[PDB]
């Protein structure tokens, strides 16, 4: 059998001068690396086997040893950066790229997978895979009229590897590589498999995680309507990256934000802002905070969609990280909104939940809240109602909390605290 070989025995077989002995030893190594918990990756490396495996990738006449060596190297490359580096250092990148053209789909798929692990190490190996020319043969595998004719597992591995070529920053992937990949990504983003959709969304989320020029090349491809549809998916693994991507996009320009609104995104946020998963709530409120930082007509669309009561709700009760994003959403709203928009905020009940959060042991939320209160008072001044507002704040325990903050270890806290207490109380 080929089960439970020692490393010593694998070495003896791979050093034989017999391709069939080498194949059996490579299989035994594959099974150590794939069938164990705590696979002995470092022992295999220390035995000097990586260069042998890499040379087996080139044995066109023995497709089984190509497959077994590709799988062994895939799992070595799945480990630590040092283990991935040993695979790269053995010459594996160009050997795997040559295997993308194999007429055996299971071998081409294993090469796709291995290159995804290498690229997933970080930006340097990602860019090194790209420089060895991986993108053209990868995209050629998806150049079919209908994706549904490809094996499902095959398409999932291809999508996953492409997403790693879009992943990581410092630096971001080369502009030319993004432009080359995007048309295929947009196609995968319309495919009816949940895992392909999830990894496609992740890739778009990476590509929109950057400056406005990066966001623009994604938005120009027309993907926002489809992101908004996927935002409505029942599968959490799809909603999570779709929401990340939409959230990134609205950190762009007000015109980029407006594409999200025009596509109907705000209609999904009653559900997102009440979502049972804490992380969805948090990222939805973060997204709202970058919408209320826009233009007054964009704030107005937040109002029209009925979302201000949902922000009051999360400020009133949510995980604290979400409550902090909600505080930011409120300060941005009050900094950019009209007087009538700010009045509406107060009629929805913002004051009390805002005051109760001044009990937080977190310095930054305090400043954010105090700045919003200031902005709300400035709106009342324009109306001559600073008094009714002072009462509201006192009536709910607000003045007491603002007073306590005059004795706060932070500079800008007790200065802004004092200024309100004197100018209005």
């Amino acid at each position: 059998g080929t089960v439970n070989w020692s490393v010593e025995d694998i070495v003896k077989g791979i050093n034989s001068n017999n391709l069939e002995s080498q194949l059996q030893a490579t299989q035994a190594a594959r099974k150590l690396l794939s069938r164990e918990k705590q696979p002995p990756i470092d022992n295999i490396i220390r035995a000097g086997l990586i260069p042998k495996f890499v040379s087996f990738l080139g044995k066109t006449d023995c497709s089984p040893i190509q497959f077994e060596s590709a799988w062994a190297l895939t799992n070595i490359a799945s480990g630590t950066s040092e283990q991935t580096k040993a695979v790269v250092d053995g010459g594996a990148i160009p050997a795997f790229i040559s295997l993308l053209a194999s007429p055996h789909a299971h071998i081409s798929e294993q090469a796709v997978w291995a290159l995804g692990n290498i690229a997933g190490d970080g930006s340097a190996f990602r860019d090194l895979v790209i420089k060895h020319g991986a993108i053209d043969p990868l995209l050629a595998l998806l150049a079919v009229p209908d994706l549904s004719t490809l094996a499902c597992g095959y398409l999932r591995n291809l999508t996953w590897t492409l997403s790693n070529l879009c992943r990581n920053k410092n630096p971001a992937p080369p502009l030319d590589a993004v432009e080359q990949i995007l048309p295929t990504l947009v196609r995968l983003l319309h495919h009816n498999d949940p895992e392909v959709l999830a990894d496609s969304c992740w890739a778009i989320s990476y590509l929109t995680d950057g400056p406005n020029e990066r966001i623009e090349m994604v938005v120009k491809k027309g993907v926002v309507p489809q992101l908004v549809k996927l935002l409505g998916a029942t599968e959490l693994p799809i909603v999570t990256p779709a929401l990340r991507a939409i959230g990134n996009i609205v950190t762009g320009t007000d015109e980029q934000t407006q594409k999200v609104i025009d596509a109907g995104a705000l209609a999904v946020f009653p559900s997102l802002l009440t979502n049972p998963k804490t992380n969805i709530q948090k990222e939805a409120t973060w997204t709202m905070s970058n919408i209320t930082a826009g233009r007054q007509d964009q704030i107005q669309q937040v109002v029209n969609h009925g979302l201000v009561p949902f922000l009051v709700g999360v400020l009133s009760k949510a995980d604290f990280k979400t409550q902090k994003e909600a505080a930011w959403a409120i300060t941005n709203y009050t900094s950019g909104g009209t007087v009538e928009q700010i009045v509406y905020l107060v009629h929805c009940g913002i004051i009390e939940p805002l005051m109760n959060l001044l009990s937080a042991k977190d310095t930054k939320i305090i400043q954010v809240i105090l700045d919003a209160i200031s902005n709300i008072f400035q709106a009342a001044e324009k109306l001559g109602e600073t008094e009714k507002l002072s009462i509201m704040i006192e009536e709910c325990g607000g003045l007491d909390k603002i007073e306590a903050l005059q004795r706060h270890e932070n500079e800008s806290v007790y200065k802004a605290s004092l200024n309100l207490i004197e100018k209005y109380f």
Binding site: K31, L33, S34, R35, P39, W71, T74, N75, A77, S78, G79, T84, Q110, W113, G116, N117, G120, D121, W160, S163, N164, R167, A198, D199, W202, P241
Partner: peptide
């Protein structure tokens, strides 16, 4: 999403 994936049995 996972940065790296082992092919396991």
């Amino acid at each position: 999403e996972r940065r790296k994936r082992a092919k396991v049995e």
